[PDB]
């Protein structure tokens, strides 16, 4: 509810070329009042999953979560001025890390286990009573 999209260019598999516009999709968010519209936008933005390429999602999210934006007190110089770098914080990427571990031990073994006796093959997982 309250979300309009104007896209068509991006989709998984798509290849973004260096030649044109960087645009992926335009998101339009509607609500009865402006505060509710902001959080509608915020919910949809954060719900986006884009992989394979960098985006401006974090930067879009920072703008709309800004106090000066929420209370409508920004001038045109706001972005060039606020930063308040914003800018940053990284990403955990835990799943990829785990998969790296599993692949490593699957291929190379664990140093504490690799030359020591081995448990009887597919023995029962322990069951919590």
């Amino acid at each position: 509810f309250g979300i309009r999209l104007d896209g068509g260019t991006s989709y998984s598999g798509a290849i973004i070329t260096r030649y044109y516009d960087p645009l992926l999709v335009k998101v339009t968010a509607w609500a009865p009042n402006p505060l509710e519209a902001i959080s509608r936008m915020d919910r949809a933005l954060r719900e986006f999953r884009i992989r394979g390429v960098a985006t401006n999602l974090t930067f879009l999210e920072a703008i709309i979560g800004h106090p000066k934006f929420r209370d409508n007190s920004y001038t045109t110089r706001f972005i060039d001025t606020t930063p308040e770098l914003f800018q940053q914080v990284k990403r955990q990427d835990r799943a990829t890390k785990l998969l790296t571990y599993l692949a490593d031990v699957t291929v190379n073994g664990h140093p504490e286990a690799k030359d020591r006796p081995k448990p009887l093959e597919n023995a029962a997982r322990p069951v919590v009573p």
Partner: peptide, 21 residues
Amino acid sequence: MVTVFFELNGQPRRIKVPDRA
């Protein structure tokens, strides 16, 4: 290099690790 082909939550993922062994 060895690549391990995973499915993560339904989705394919390839990971590359040295073959130290």
